[PDB]
Design an enzyme around this catalytic site. Structure first.
Site, PDB file in Angstrom:
ATOM      1  N   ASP A 113      -1.354   5.459  -5.647  1.00 39.21           N
ATOM      2  CA  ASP A 113      -1.787   4.638  -4.537  1.00 39.21           C
ATOM      3  C   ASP A 113      -2.244   3.234  -4.916  1.00 39.21           C
ATOM      4  O   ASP A 113      -3.380   3.033  -5.329  1.00 39.21           O
ATOM      5  CB  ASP A 113      -2.921   5.359  -3.835  1.00 39.21           C
ATOM      6  CG  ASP A 113      -3.531   4.528  -2.782  1.00 39.21           C
ATOM      7  OD1 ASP A 113      -2.753   3.766  -2.176  1.00 39.21           O
ATOM      8  OD2 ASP A 113      -4.769   4.617  -2.586  1.00 39.21           O
ATOM      9  N   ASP A 145       0.797  -1.207   0.000  1.00 43.47           N
ATOM     10  CA  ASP A 145       0.000   0.000   0.000  1.00 43.47           C
ATOM     11  C   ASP A 145       0.838   1.269   0.000  1.00 43.47           C
ATOM     12  O   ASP A 145       1.252   1.732   1.067  1.00 43.47           O
ATOM     13  CB  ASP A 145      -0.942   0.004   1.201  1.00 43.47           C
ATOM     14  CG  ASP A 145      -1.823   1.219   1.213  1.00 43.47           C
ATOM     15  OD1 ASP A 145      -2.069   1.741   0.105  1.00 43.47           O
ATOM     16  OD2 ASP A 145      -2.226   1.679   2.301  1.00 43.47           O
TER      17      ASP A 145
HETATM   18  N1  LIG Z   1      -4.141   3.709   0.140  1.00 45.58           N
HETATM   19  C1  LIG Z   1      -4.968   3.523   1.091  1.00 45.58           C
HETATM   20  C2  LIG Z   1      -6.296   3.909   0.960  1.00 45.58           C
HETATM   21  C3  LIG Z   1      -7.167   3.695   2.000  1.00 45.58           C
HETATM   22  C4  LIG Z   1      -6.694   3.119   3.169  1.00 45.58           C
HETATM   23  C5  LIG Z   1      -7.512   2.876   4.260  1.00 45.58           C
HETATM   24  C6  LIG Z   1      -6.995   2.307   5.404  1.00 45.58           C
HETATM   25  C7  LIG Z   1      -5.657   1.970   5.471  1.00 45.58           C
HETATM   26  C8  LIG Z   1      -4.828   2.197   4.390  1.00 45.58           C
HETATM   27  C9  LIG Z   1      -5.326   2.768   3.234  1.00 45.58           C
HETATM   28  N2  LIG Z   1      -4.484   2.969   2.213  1.00 45.58           N
END
Ligand SMILES: Nc1ccc2ccccc2n1
Length: 377
Positions: free
Chosen positions: A220, A34
């Site tokens: 992202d 992520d």
């Molecule tokens: N990139 C991203 C979007 C939403 C999230 C929500 C919770 C934790 C990590 C996240 N990463």
């Protein structure tokens, strides 16, 4: 680097994960990759949807930092206990680092029922780490404690089951074709960038580029969709609506409140425009552009309990936190996170899903003036 090729798996809509190990002896977990967050966080308790979890009691190298974290987000949250322990990436470099680990002891709409991942690897920067910017992100610990160069790269393919590669510490030229183009990372918090122009089909939206980045544009891997600010979204859809007037669809479809479908093997590709985002380049007044096909913004809904056709969703959607270039964008391209040089590189992916008509493209240079004015303050 071929040892890291094909080290990411997943399922459509449920993100991409890489295999990791925590503690001594190594406990294997699958951890979502992520680039939109900055915490290494893992299930540490037997939530019924998890296949496995961090059992600290089993780890001789575990250490408690005696401090909790609470992470709320839109309809959801996770919450846990901070420590550090030894971490390795079996299909990654041949190191072991001591990293921060948040042991998730409570969560709400975080884990997905039926997913095969048990944690999240935040690859973004400390600035947005939680609880505060002193909690050193994994990747910073990795680079600081090894001779692993300060860059990683991502080839997100996807098809059902999905796959890809996370190349830690380098670039693998077998995963792209043509040439990498680079856009600056504006600030080291998210992977922030500046979209300077936008074109549907070739025609452009003539919007004050500043809107394309209100208040942010990020890359992202955690988000599925190309997410656009509201004015940009309307403008964008309005123009996609028009280009695609060969057929009629529900109005709520575009808003992601309804699916749309065609008979098996009967999807009309060419009624849909290519979308091109011009990104700020490395040199004053110079930009390049990335172009994605409808196979990127129209993604199949895996299974519908009450249907039997080719039902896609529309993967472009409004937003209040800025543009978010998610799997919709990233699946067309090999993406290089060049942390050492404050820049992100895009090349046509060796695996994007293409037909015999069109192709995902990365092209430049172009002359674009006043690219800084496109950044919000
Ligand atoms: N990139 C991203 C979007 C939403 C999230 C929500 C919770 C934790 C990590 C996240 N990463």
């Amino acid at each position: 680097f071929v040892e890291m090729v094909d080290n990411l798996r997943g399922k459509s809509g449920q993100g991409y994960y890489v295999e990791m190990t925590v503690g001594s002896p190594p406990q294997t977990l699958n951890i979502l990759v992520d680039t939109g967050s900055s915490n290494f966080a893992v299930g540490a308790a037997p939530h019924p949807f998890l296949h496995r979890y961090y059992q600290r009691q089993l780890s001789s190298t575990y250490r408690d930092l005696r401090k909790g974290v609470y992470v709320p987000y839109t309809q959801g949250k996770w919450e846990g206990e901070l420590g550090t322990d030894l971490v390795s990436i079996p299909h990654g470099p041949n190191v072991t680092v001591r990293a921060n680990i948040a042991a998730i002891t409570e969560s709400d709409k975080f884990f997905i029922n039926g997913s095969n991942w048990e944690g999240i690897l935040g690859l973004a920067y400390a600035e947005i780490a939680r609880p505060d910017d002193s909690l050193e992100p994994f990747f910073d610990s990795l680079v600081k404690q090894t001779h692993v160069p300060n860059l990683f790269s991502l080839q997100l393919c996807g098809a059902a089951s999905v796959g890809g590669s996370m190349i830690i510490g380098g670039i693998d030229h077998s995963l792209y074709t043509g040439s990498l183009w680079y856009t600056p990372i504006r600030r080291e918090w998210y992977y922030e960038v500046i979209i300077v122009r936008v074109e549907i089909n070739g025609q452009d939206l003539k919007m004050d580029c500043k809107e394309y980045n209100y208040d942010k544009s990020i890359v992202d891997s955690g988000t599925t969709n190309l997410r656009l600010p509201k004015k940009v979204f309307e403008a964008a859809v309005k123009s996609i609506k028009a280009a695609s007037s060969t057929e009629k669809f529900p109005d709520g479809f575009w808003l992601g409140e309804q699916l749309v479908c065609w008979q098996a093997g009967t999807t009309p590709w060419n009624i849909f425009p290519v979308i091109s985002l011009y990104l700020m380049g490395e040199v004053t007044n110079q930009s390049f552009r990335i172009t994605i096909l409808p196979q990127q913004y129209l993604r199949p809904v895996e299974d519908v309990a009450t249907s039997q056709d080719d039902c896609y969703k529309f993967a472009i959607s409004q937003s209040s936190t800025g543009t978010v270039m998610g799997a919709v964008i990233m699946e067309g391209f090999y993406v290089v996170f060049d942390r050492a040089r404050k820049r992100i590189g895009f090349a046509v992916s060796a695996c994007h899903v293409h037909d015999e008509f069109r192709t995902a493209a990365v092209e430049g240079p172009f002359v674009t003036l006043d690219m800084e004015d496109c950044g919000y303050n």
